[PDB]
Design a protein around this ligand. Structure first.
Ligand SMILES: CNc1ncc2cc(-c3cc(NC(=O)NCCC(C)(C)C)c(F)cc3C)c(C)nc2n1
Length: 254
């Protein structure tokens, strides 16, 4: 079992809070991250069993490591502690300038993790650079580091919400396409539009899409074509991760 026996965790500094939990740094055989999700309602009890259920199906280096869960006093999920910042932070907050080979490597490791989740029939549903951690500044850890459950990474069919369920291996691929655009541009899509509602309406109709012409000239053609393919408006034109990963792997070998 992964139940952490009671009172073994030394909860330290609070890292963040939102409507759906509070996250702390803890001590449990070393540093850990602890997310505490509250007396708990049945909506909350169910979301807890779901996240635990999904986490415990994963053992891969590019996916954040689940370590256990506590049930009392509060519902809590315990994972490894990550050191450093999200890809979002590096690209758009402290604007780190990475060597092309490092951008491509970030791309590779994210594709590795996603390929993995999908091999297990796990749809992420919220992949964004903010949920890509660069641990030790070198290793990608995909998780969900947010506390609020996000439109720039949302596939057109997700926005319309007309074919519901709209989430699919392919909506994840789209999001990943938006991550590659960030990698290869240093920027978020649609930065010259300052109106959320319109981006929403325009992406969902296919009126607006990421400006691929902004892609750095030192980016390999093959990476640019991969981006355009992932970003495809009609979901089943998008490659899946086995194909996505093989491409990044192929181009890196050059
Ligand atoms: C800042 N460092 C750091 N390290 C580790 C961190 C770990 C988490 C975290 C994240 C999750 N959830 C989580 O990552 N869910 C998505 C998993 C999936 C990719 C398999 C679909 C959790 F259940 C518990 C915790 C503690 C969070 C929210 N933030 C973290 N922050």
């Amino acid at each position: 079992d992964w139940e952490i026996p009671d009172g073994q965790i030394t909860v330290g500094q609070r890292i963040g809070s939102g409507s759906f939990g509070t996250v702390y740094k803890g001590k449990w055989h070393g540093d850990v991250a602890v997310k505490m999700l509250n007396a708990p309602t049945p909506q909350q009890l169910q979301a807890f069993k779901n996240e635990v259920g999904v986490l415990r199906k994963t053992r891969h280096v590019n996916i954040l490591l689940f370590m256990g869960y506590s049930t009392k006093p509060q519902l809590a999920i315990v994972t490894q502690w990550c050191e450093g910042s999200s890809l979002y932070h590096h690209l758009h907050i402290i604007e780190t300038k990475f060597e092309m080979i490092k951008l491509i490597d970030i791309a590779r490791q994210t594709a590795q993790g996603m390929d993995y989740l999908h091999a297990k029939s796990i749809i992420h549903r919220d992949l964004k650079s903010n949920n890509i951690f660069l641990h030790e500044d070198l290793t990608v850890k995909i998780g969900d580091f947010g506390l609020a459950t996000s439109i720039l990474w949302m596939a057109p069919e997700v926005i319309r919400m007309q074919d519901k369920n709209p989430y699919s291996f392919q909506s994840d691929v789209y999001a990943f396409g938006i991550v590659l655009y960030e990698l290869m541009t240093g920027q978020l899509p649609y930065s010259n539009i300052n109106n959320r509602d319109q981006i929403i309406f325009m992406v969902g109709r296919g009126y607006l899409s990421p400006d691929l012409s902004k892609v750095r000239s030192n980016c390999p053609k093959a990476m640019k074509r991969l981006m355009a393919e992932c970003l495809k408006k009609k979901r089943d034109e998008r490659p899946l991760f086995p194909q996505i990963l093989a491409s990044i792997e192929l181009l890196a070998r050059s």
